[PDB]
Amino acid sequence: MASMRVLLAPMEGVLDSLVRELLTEVNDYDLCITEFVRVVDQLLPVKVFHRICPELQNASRTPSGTLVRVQLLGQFPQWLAENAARAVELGSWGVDLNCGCPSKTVNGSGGGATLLKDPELIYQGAKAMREAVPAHLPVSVKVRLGWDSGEKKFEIADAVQQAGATELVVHGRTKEQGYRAEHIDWQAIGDIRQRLNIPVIANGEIWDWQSAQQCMAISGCDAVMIGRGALNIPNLSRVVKYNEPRMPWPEVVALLQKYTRLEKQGDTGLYHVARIKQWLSYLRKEYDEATELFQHVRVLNNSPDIARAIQAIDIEKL
Numbered sequence: 419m420a421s422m423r424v425l426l427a428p429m430e431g432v433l434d435s436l437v438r439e440l441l442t443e444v445n446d447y448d449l450c451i452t453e454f455v456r457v458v459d460q461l462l463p464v465k466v467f468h469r470i471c472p473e474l475q476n477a478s479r480t481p482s483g484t485l486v487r488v489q490l491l492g493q494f495p496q497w498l499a500e501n502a503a504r505a506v507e508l509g510s511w512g513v514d515l516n517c518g519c520p521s522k523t524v525n526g527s528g529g530g531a532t533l534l535k536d537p538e539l540i541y542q543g544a545k546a547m548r549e550a551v552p553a554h555l556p557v558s559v560k561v562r563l564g565w566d567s568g569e570k571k572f573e574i575a576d577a578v579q580q581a582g583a584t585e586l587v588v589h590g591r592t593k594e595q596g597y598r599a600e601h602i603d604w605q606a607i608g609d610i611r612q613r614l615n616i617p618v619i620a621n622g623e624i625w626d627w628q629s630a631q632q633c634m635a636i637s638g639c640d641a642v643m644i645g646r647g648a649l650n651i652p653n654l655s656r657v658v659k660y661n662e663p664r665m666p667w668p669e670v671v672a673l674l675q676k677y678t679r680l681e682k683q684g685d686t687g688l689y690h691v692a693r694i695k696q697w698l699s700y701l702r703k704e705y706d707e708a709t710e711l712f713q714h715v716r717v718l719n720n721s722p723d724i725a726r727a728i729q730a731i732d733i734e735k736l
């Protein structure tokens with residue numbers, strides 16, 4: 419009965435430092451990846467890295483102690499390398515490169531999924547980052563299987579290994595397959611793993627204990643990355659590693675109350691409401707109780723009204 423790694427996926431516009439703080443304290447995530455820093459042709463200021471990844475000031479860990487890694491998105495090897503170096507100087511435990519997400523091409527620099535059309539770009543990006551990060555810290559890369567087909571999936575994988583990356587996360591879909599459940603190919607993740615000599619972390623459609631078991635049995639990976647599921651089920655790392663039942667509704671309400679108490683405390687803004695609405699939108703998929711709450715919360719505009727709504731729910735009488 420085997421060791422296993424579970425990583426918390428990066429999620430631009432959904433997961434920030436505060437949500438990472440809350441989730442990690444009720445989970446056993448081995449690592450969270452931050453939402454990406456967009457790299458074009460410039461070294462980004464220290465403020466940008468600290469505000470995206472406050473954990474850099476706590477030895478690259480959430481307050482409960484979970485490691486966090488800074489992600490980059492961009493194409494130009496010079497600048498990835500220089501931003502990679504800055505993330506590490508500031509204390510990031512290694513650095514990740516995003517080759518999975520659809521992304522605008524700004525100033526001739528593409529990024530994310532658009533690199534999947536030309537694996538040589540991934541090789542050059544990742545290799546410059548590997549050369550600029552001290553050799554003992556890791557450099558990871560996240561990929562999809564290709565742009566509009568999986569034909570280049572092994573070329574993408576090789577590019578990452580040959581650049582000297584430490585590990586590879588495979589979102590087992592193409593870019594054009596988006597998030598459609600019917601297209602996840604965990605078997606291709608496995609075919610990739612077999613060919614490589616670095617750890618492959620399986621990603622996509624991992625919702626619960628059984629799905630994770632199924633995914634690992636097919637891919638052969640002893641590591642997985644959970645994204646949307648980590649919001650659907652707040653203790654999903656424990657569900658997946660130990661077959662814990664899903665967090666019961668009264669404990670998730672307690673968690674959201676805490677969200678709103680830290681919301682105000684951190685001074686995160688008078689109209690900082692999107693992530694709390696989004697979280698509830700995800701929680702409808704697993705908890706019938708969250709549909710009523712989401713309705714009452716979605717029509718609200720500001721963080722104070724939303725807090726009173728949520729921290730007025732009596733956890734006992736429930």
Ligand SMILES: Cc1cc2nc3c(=O)[nH]c(=O)nc-3n(C[C@H](O)[C@H](O)[C@H](O)COP(=O)(O)O)c2cc1C
Pocket residue numbers: 427428429430431432452453454489516518519560589621622623624643644645646647
């Ligand atoms: C709203 C949203 C934002 C995302 N932002 C990022 C991101 O910043 N960087 C990244 O590498 N992946 C990002 N992803 C992709 C996830 O990391 C993950 O690969 C994807 O959701 C598949 O995992 P799942 O089926 O567990 O959710 C995002 C996904 C969603 C839905």
